[PDB]
Design an enzyme around this catalytic site. Structure first.
Site, short mmCIF file in Angstrom:
data_model
loop_
_atom_site.label_atom_id
_atom_site.label_comp_id
_atom_site.label_asym_id
_atom_site.label_seq_id
_atom_site.Cartn_x
_atom_site.Cartn_y
_atom_site.Cartn_z
N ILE A 165 0.74 -0.45 -0.20
CA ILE A 165 0.20 -0.25 -0.12
C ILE A 165 0.57 0.95 -0.24
CG2 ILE A 165 -1.91 -1.46 1.13
CD1 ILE A 165 -1.48 0.64 3.86
N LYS B 247 5.54 3.42 1.17
CA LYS B 247 5.44 2.45 0.62
C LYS B 247 5.06 1.72 1.86
CE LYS B 247 5.24 0.56 -4.36
NZ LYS B 247 6.23 0.21 -5.54
N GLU C 196 9.21 11.23 -1.47
CA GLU C 196 8.93 12.13 -1.79
C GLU C 196 7.39 12.11 -1.73
OE1 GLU C 196 9.90 14.99 -5.35
OE2 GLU C 196 10.63 12.91 -6.81
N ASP D 102 7.71 -2.13 -15.29
CA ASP D 102 6.42 -1.89 -15.31
C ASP D 102 5.87 -0.83 -16.37
OD1 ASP D 102 3.37 -3.26 -14.54
OD2 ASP D 102 4.12 -1.87 -12.52
C1 LIG Z 1 5.33 6.59 -4.06
N1 LIG Z 1 4.43 7.78 -4.35
C2 LIG Z 1 4.80 9.09 -4.44
N2 LIG Z 1 3.84 10.47 -4.55
C3 LIG Z 1 2.59 9.58 -4.63
N3 LIG Z 1 1.52 9.64 -4.53
C4 LIG Z 1 0.38 9.61 -5.04
N4 LIG Z 1 0.65 7.95 -5.34
C5 LIG Z 1 -0.43 7.06 -6.53
N5 LIG Z 1 -0.83 5.73 -6.58
C6 LIG Z 1 -0.66 4.36 -5.41
C7 LIG Z 1 -1.50 3.46 -6.20
C8 LIG Z 1 -1.42 2.72 -7.71
N6 LIG Z 1 -0.74 1.34 -8.51
C9 LIG Z 1 -0.46 4.36 -8.01
C10 LIG Z 1 -0.33 5.27 -7.79
N7 LIG Z 1 -1.53 7.84 -5.93
C11 LIG Z 1 -2.18 8.76 -5.53
C12 LIG Z 1 -3.29 9.64 -5.58
C13 LIG Z 1 -3.46 10.91 -5.38
C14 LIG Z 1 -2.35 11.78 -4.72
CL1 LIG Z 1 -2.40 13.82 -4.67
C15 LIG Z 1 -0.93 10.86 -5.52
C16 LIG Z 1 -0.62 9.72 -5.52
C17 LIG Z 1 3.22 7.74 -5.00
#
Ligand SMILES: Cn1cnc(Nc2nc(N3CCC(N)CC3)nc3ccc(Cl)cc23)c1
EC number: 2.7.11.1
Length: 290
Positions: A36, A52, A98, A142
């Protein structure tokens, strides 16, 4: 191998400590195949970060978790998600990076329609990162819109390195079956040895994503789609009338069925389609302001 062996092997790559001692306000924002993704605040600074969180037991191939750490440890780049620390927390690996507040590209492709300025901006960013990573021998495996993150000011960064492999002058090709079906190169599907060429194929599928709104054969079950990619002649665009001959020729250099004739990242970096590439400010008017 036992869980405690992988746990100990991780204790040697990650940083010591419990990051729960300085992170609060966790907000789940998504799932990947590996775990997640949360937002959290750092008490020391007020800054927001993404965390993560991957359960070691919940992992098909535990050995891929090292990639989650090693790539961003060694490959700082303006088009790559930047990592700060990694920690082992109980039986979960945590990676603190970040917070890219513009979400993933998937939110843009299924909800707006991008112009060629924007498509070229995304492809330029992805290609720059891919040429740095391919040079020093890493295969992402990927590539897709879900793996692309943005900011409010249109910066584009490559993410989700969970699936990488490294190729060398010793072992040059690579045989394992990983990636998301619809985006997989055909040599990878028929399970021949492959190299970084697969990323280039997958980038081509991403371009179809940006043009049509979904990858080829997205209607079918996974396995049908893969066999389709192996048998068929390559996928024929829907919105072909919206695409310039610039983009058409670029895309034609991406989706070459034979990986020897397929352009390398560093070759595509010089293609004229990328001249259309709008600045970061060009990818602002399509997040959540329409
Ligand atoms: C590592 N990381 C650094 N910044 C982010 N921002 C985000 N990542 C993901 N995801 C997680 C699940 C999906 N599989 C791929 C996208 N979704 C988002 C939705 C709204 C906003 Cl505001 C930011 C993010 C992730």
């Amino acid at each position: 191998s036992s869980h405690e062996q992988f746990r100990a092997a991780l204790q040697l790559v990650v940083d010591p400590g419990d990051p729960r001692s300085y992170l609060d306000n966790f907000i789940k924002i998504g799932e990947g195949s590996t775990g997640i993704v949360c937002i959290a605040t750092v008490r020391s600074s007020g800054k927001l970060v993404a965390v993560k969180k991957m359960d070691l037991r919940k992992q098909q191939r535990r050995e891929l978790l090292f990639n989650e750490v090693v790539i961003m440890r060694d490959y700082q780049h303006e088009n790559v998600v930047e990592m700060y620390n990694s920690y082992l927390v109980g039986d979960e690996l945590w990676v603190v990076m970040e917070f890219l507040e513009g979400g993933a590209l998937t939110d843009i492709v299924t909800h707006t329609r991008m112009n060629e300025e924007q498509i070229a901006a995304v492809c330029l960013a992805v290609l720059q990162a891919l040429s740095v990573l391919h040079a020093q021998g890493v295969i992402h495996r990927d590539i897709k819109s879900d793996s692309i993150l943005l900011t409010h000011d249109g910066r584009v960064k490559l993410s989700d390195f969970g699936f990488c492999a490294q190729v060398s002058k010793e072992v040059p090709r690579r045989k394992s079956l990983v990636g998301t079906p619809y985006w997989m190169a055909p040599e990878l599907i028929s399970r021949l040895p492959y190299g970084p060429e697969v990323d280039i194929w997958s980038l081509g599928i991403m371009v179809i994503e940006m043009v049509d709104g979904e990858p080829p054969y997205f209607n079918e079950p996974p396995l049908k789609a893969m066999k389709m990619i192996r048998d068929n002649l390559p996928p024929r665009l829907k919105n072909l009338h919206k695409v310039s001959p610039s983009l058409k020729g670029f895309l034609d250099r991406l989706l070459v069925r034979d990986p020897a004739q397929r352009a390398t990242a560093a070759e595509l970096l010089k293609h004229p389609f990328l001249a259309k590439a709008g600045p970061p400010a060009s990818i602002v008017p399509l997040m959540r302001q329409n």
